[PDB]
């Protein structure tokens with residue numbers, strides 16, 4: 001959907017080892033993050049590796065990339081905000 005709630009975007013999370021690896025590949029140096037930071041780094045990961053489609057740039061192709069293994073889909077749109085949340089939550093432990 002869109003506009004995920006503020007307190008969700010601020011949830012403190014511990015990425016599991018695969019998502020941690022990805023985060024660390026774009027310069028993140030922590031064990032714990034907010035969701036908004038995780039999304040920031042994944043953003044950066046996609047930009048830097050150019051995983052977006054050249055012609056339809058809201059589509060991300062993640063087959064044959066680590067991102068593909070994290071999300072378990074061959075692609076997704078950047079407009080599908082809840083789906084993205086949902087795929088990322090599988091890859092982390094909420095901090096209590």
Ligand SMILES: C[C@H]1CC[C@H](Cn2c(N3CCO[C@@H]4CCC[C@H]43)nc3cc(-c4noc(=O)[nH]4)nc(-c4cncc(Cl)c4)c32)CC1
Pocket residue numbers: 002039040042043044046047052057058078079080081082084085
């Ligand atoms: C998995 C990963 C999560 C973060 C997003 C960030 N992000 C991006 N980036 C930003 C960094 O550079 C990147 C290269 C191509 C993609 C570029 N562009 C978005 C467009 C829309 C959009 N356009 O129309 C709409 O409705 N949303 N949304 C977000 C968005 C921001 N924060 C939270 C959410 Cl869940 C989504 C966008 C990309 C995907």
